[PDB]
Amino acid sequence: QVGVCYGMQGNNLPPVSEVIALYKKSNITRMRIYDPNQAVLEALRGSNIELILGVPNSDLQSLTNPSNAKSWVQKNVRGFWSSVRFRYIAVGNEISPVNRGTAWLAQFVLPAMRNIHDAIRSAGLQDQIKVSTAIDLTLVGNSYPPSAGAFRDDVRSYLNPIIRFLSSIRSPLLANIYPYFTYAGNPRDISLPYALFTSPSVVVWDGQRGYKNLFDATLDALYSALERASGGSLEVVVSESGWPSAGAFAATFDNGRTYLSNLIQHVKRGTPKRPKRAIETYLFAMFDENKKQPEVEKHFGLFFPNKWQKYNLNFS
Ligand SMILES: C[As](C)(=O)[O-]
């Protein structure tokens, strides 16, 4: 089942309780939150909803201290484990050692992960609850063609030991992935059917491998980079994907509806490189978030804040 990211940065959003109800109502059994909001945590009790619990980047620093991490796990994890199906903890989101926004935090990620996981195992929850981190693909320097997929040379010192850690505790890697921005930046080279999963024939040829949609190509591009960095056994959970209804080039209702509907359907299966396993995927995001900037980041909602659906999707 597809999951949905619950961002709460709007001035017009439903009460937490109604949002959970709406999740249950729409039969959405998977959620991603970006911080451990207690009301949300208390609201998920007995929901049977598998949860991605996020560590906010501002606390990464704090958690490089083992004791801060311990108390972090006690308050937010052990206090709820009876009734909340914590699935993954996403320690940091879109951290890069070379992106201006997050560079000074990179040092913190792996230690945080060890302390939380260390904290996690002491409570004996390590086979249910996988410690990981959620990346963006700014870290991937090459993805064309997909077989050539490789991480940026200047991010290898950062990613390498993180991969190693993940391999050893058998955790997957989490990736936020937006075919939308790939398309939006280069519609001359990227065809909309390619971006939207509606292409009858392959669009990208990779030796003997043909890519029909932008989403399949990119993940496999990620897979090739993981394989070159000693993560050939890592699973990828896709922790964000979405298409905006307004605010910029190609931000339209129809595109949104197409993209998201094929996607929900697509991930019932895999990619041209790893056909067996289903892609665990989290749709971004449940509500428009009128506080985000710029304009287009306020329209990723799948639902209006009055809780009527934007796109009329089956999540079942
Ligand atoms: C834009 As190209 C030549 O890397 O497919």
Three-state SS sequence of 43-93: HCCCCCCEEEEEECHHHHCHHHCHHHHHHHHHHHHHCCCCCCCEEEEEEEE
User: Can you give the resolution of this entry in Å?
Assistant: 2.7
Selection from 91, 36, 17, 98 nearest residue 60 by Cα: 91
Instruction: Name the residue at shortest CA distance from atom 3 of ligand 1.
Output: 144
Selection from 91, 97, 109 nearest residue 156 by Cα: 97
Tokens of 282: 């989290």
Instruction: Name the residue at shortest CA distance from atom 1 of ligand 1.
Output: 189
Instruction: Name the residue at shortest CA distance from atom 2 of ligand 1.
Output: 144
Ligand 1 centre from 145 Cα, in Å? 8
**Does the beta carbon of 154 lie inside 6 Å of ligand 1?**
no
**Does the beta carbon of 189 lie inside 6 Å of ligand 1?**
yes
Which residues are within 8 A (CB) of 22 and not within 5 positions of it... i.e. 6 or more apart?
A: 14, 286, 303, 307
First to last CA, the chain: 7
Q: Is 42 a catalytic residue?
A: no
Report how far residue 124's alpha carbon sits from residue 3's, in angstroms, rounded to the nearest whole number: 26
Selection from 81, 74, 99, 10 nearest residue 44 by Cα: 81
Neighbours of 48 (CB within 10 A): 10
Selection from 248, 230, 263 nearest residue 161 by Cα: 230
CA atoms within 13 A on the CB side of 189: 6
Instruction: Name the residue at shortest CA distance from atom 4 of ligand 1.
Output: 144
Tokens of 136: 């963006």
Strand 209-211 and strand 204-206: the pairing is: antiparallel
Which atom, in ligand 1's list, is nearest to the CA of 189? 1
Neighbours of 306 (CB within 10 A): 9
Report how far residue 217's alpha carbon sits from residue 196's, in angstroms, rounded to the nearest whole number: 13
**Does the beta carbon of 304 lie inside 6 Å of ligand 1?**
no
Helices 66-73, 106-122: crossing angle, 10 deg rounding = 50
**Does the beta carbon of 205 lie inside 6 Å of ligand 1?**
no
Q: How was this structure determined?
A: X-ray
Report how far residue 250's alpha carbon sits from residue 239's, in angstroms, rounded to the nearest whole number: 23
DSSP-assigned states of every residue in the chain: --EEE-----SSPPPHHHHHHHHHHTT--EEE-SS--HHHHHHTTT---EEEEEEPHHHHTGGGSHHHHHHHHIIIIITTTTT--EEEEEEEES--SSSTTTGGGHHHHHHHHHHHHHHHHHTT-TTTSEEEEEE-GGGEEE-SSGGG-EE-GGGHHHHHHHHHHHHHTTPPEEEE--HHHHHHH-TTTS-HHHHHT--SS-SEEETTEEE-SHHHHHHHHHHHHHHHTT-TT--EEEEEE---SSSSTT--HHHHHHHHHHHHHHTTS--SS--SS---EEES-SB--TTSSSGGGG---SB-TTS-BSS-----
- Annotation: CATH topology of 2-316: TIM Barrel (3.20.20)
Question: Cis omega before residue 305 (within 30°)?
Answer: no
**Does the beta carbon of 144 lie inside 6 Å of ligand 1?**
yes
| CB-based contact 247:299 (threshold 8 Å) | yes
Which residues are within 8 A (CB) of 277 and not within 5 positions of it... i.e. 6 or more apart?
A: 235, 270
Strand 86-93 and strand 50-55: the pairing is: parallel
| CB-based contact 116:77 (threshold 8 Å) | no
Tokens of 90: 């996403």
Instruction: Name the residue at shortest CA distance from atom 5 of ligand 1.
Output: 144
| CB-based contact 41:93 (threshold 8 Å) | no
Q: Is 94 a catalytic residue?
A: yes
Report how far residue 102's alpha carbon sits from residue 79's, in angstroms, rounded to the nearest whole number: 31
Ligand 1 pocket, mutate which of 140, 143, 144 (most atoms under 8 A from CB): 144
